[model samples]
Target: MGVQVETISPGDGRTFPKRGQTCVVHYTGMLEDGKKFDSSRDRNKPFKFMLGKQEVIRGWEEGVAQMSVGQRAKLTISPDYAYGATGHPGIIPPHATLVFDVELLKLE
Candidate 1:
């Protein structure tokens, strides 16, 4: 269930999220075919979740931890790290892998 992350933009190196801290981010979700699912930038809102809290997909927890403030990336998540064999009804498919463009906006 390893999550692979690829950088899209650079971020500051001096500061990073502390252990168990809340990560604030902007993200756009899509399928492998590039079918759009969701976007924080579309709503002008951000997502905030605690590290290792399991509130979000495990892929997010691992990927975001590697990021720093202003870091932007594309995260490729396996089903085991995402919704699993049972996918989200509204926007996802069963056994489908997921992709996300994520930006670390801040830490709280």
Candidate 2:
């Protein structure tokens, strides 16, 4: 599965969700160096999220809506749109731009 870049918003589709939307996805999270950090591919469980619900980061919400079910997308998220200045202790750095290769498996 691969995502086609049909269009990008002025914000570059980097925004968060204020509402919850459920979705199943396959994803690989990495750093700017393209180093492998985390992935759900081995888990085989679709990444479930509440879009616009704030369950996830802002970049996720903006990016998810841009995707169609069964579509795979590559997302590049800045730190401000991700974990913010505080950042995740080990997994993610503060104000780090995260890159994710995700597949929109389903939505409910």
Candidate 3:
């Protein structure tokens, strides 16, 4: 599967973030097995990344793009669009399916 999205709450929908824009969001990552990985909100801060720059994982790149500023969504991402067979060195296992609760804070 590529990516799946379920909106938990609505946002502006007035405009969507385009590629190359800086997207700031608060996100919590987890595995299919319900294991928590890391969260930007842990520090009471949000994370920022350049859209489509590959600064984040493929899953985030794809999933976050589907959201609008002030929107919160649940994204289910398969391994192919994620880390694939290699996966994250220490945090994620090989071919792990990832899930994220991402809230798009703003786009700059």
Candidate 4:
């Protein structure tokens, strides 16, 4: 995925999550048309994953690397960075470009 990230709010933290670090984020995933697909906030919980690992999507791994704790961002992900040609079946279409509103909550 050729993911493009834009900052919505800059974090006051000193650093971004690095390789092998654990990060926690809250996000709402949507299609390009603004139809929401998933939301961690809806669950009242943040999503957690290890940086630079295969624990999550490629776009997230790459995009979150650019974020700092408390930062908010929007990630526009290309197919390759997302589910790609195979898609996520009923959840997401093939070759779909995904949009995510993400907030970096913690890095450890």
Candidate 5:
């Protein structure tokens, strides 16, 4: 999975999320063409997951691993790192490339 990450807001902390650690983030997901799909901010909540636990997409695991708490970034994920050939219905399309603006809120 080749997930491209570009830091938007740098974090002050030096710690990063490791495998098996818990991570909390806020995100807005979109298509390559800029179509909105989902947003944690819209729901007024953060999304939580375990790093490297396969509970989320490969792109998120890898991309978030590069982030420190309080950092914000833009991630562009290839189809292989996302839903792949069988995309999420009504959200992601088959073989689609996805983009995300994410903020790492916490790690533990």
Candidate 6:
């Protein structure tokens, strides 16, 4: 999976996940101050997503689509690609920057 994905080039060959494809992911999210925010790894359960269904942030769709099974990477997502400038309030502040430790678990 690593070789298959890496061959495509880093920050290139931009691909988007097709609608209805299921993606399994592992992630740890943190704030700029290093405050722990969320982590699928800590919970021991990977997150699931149906692509293009809006089940996650736009960055999730963008990043996950670029990954292959077992690939891992860190992603820095601006609010515009995450919850957007408006944010969710309380859970996420407006214009917040989100950092993620992500691994592509598998396609379900």
Reference-based TM-score of each model: 0.93, 0.77, 0.94, 0.95, 0.95, 0.76
* Residues 1-108, model 1: lDDT tens digits: 568989999899656776689999999999989998999999998989999778898888888888889999899999988988999897899987899999998888
- Superposed model 3: Cα runs more than 4 Å off: none
Please provide, for model 4 over 7-82, each residue's C-alpha lDDT reduced to its tens digit, 9 standing for 90 to 100.
Answer: 9999975788889999989999999999999999999988999988789889999998888889999999999989
True lDDT of residue 50, candidate 2: 76
Better of 3 and 4 by TM-score: 4
**Per-structure clash totals for the candidates:** 0, 9, 0, 2, 0, 0
Better of 1 and 2 by TM-score: 1
Cα lDDT of candidate 4 equals 0.91
Lowest-scoring 10 consecutive residues by lDDT in candidate 6? 1-10
lDDT (tens digit, per residue) of candidate 6 on 1-108: 011122222332333346789988777887656676788988899888898888888877776776656667677777777776787666677777777777765666
Local accuracy of candidate 3 as per-residue lDDT tens digits, 77-101: 9999888999888999999998999
For candidate 1, the lDDT comes to 0.88
Candidate 1 lDDT score at position 95: 80
Candidate 4 runs further than 4 Å off: none
The total of clashing pairs for model 2 equals 9
- Candidate 2 ranges beyond 4 A from true positions: 1-20
Question: Model 2, range 1-108, lDDT digits (tens) per residue?
Answer: 122233222322333223456877788888878877789997877678777667777777777777766666788887777877898888787767788887776666
Specify the poorest-scoring 10-residue window by lDDT in model 2: 1-10
* Candidate 5 lDDT: 0.92
Q: After superposition, how far is residue 17 of candidate 6 from its true place, in Å?
A: 5.3
Best by lDDT: 5
The list of candidate 1 runs beyond 4 A from truth reads none
Clashes of 3: 0
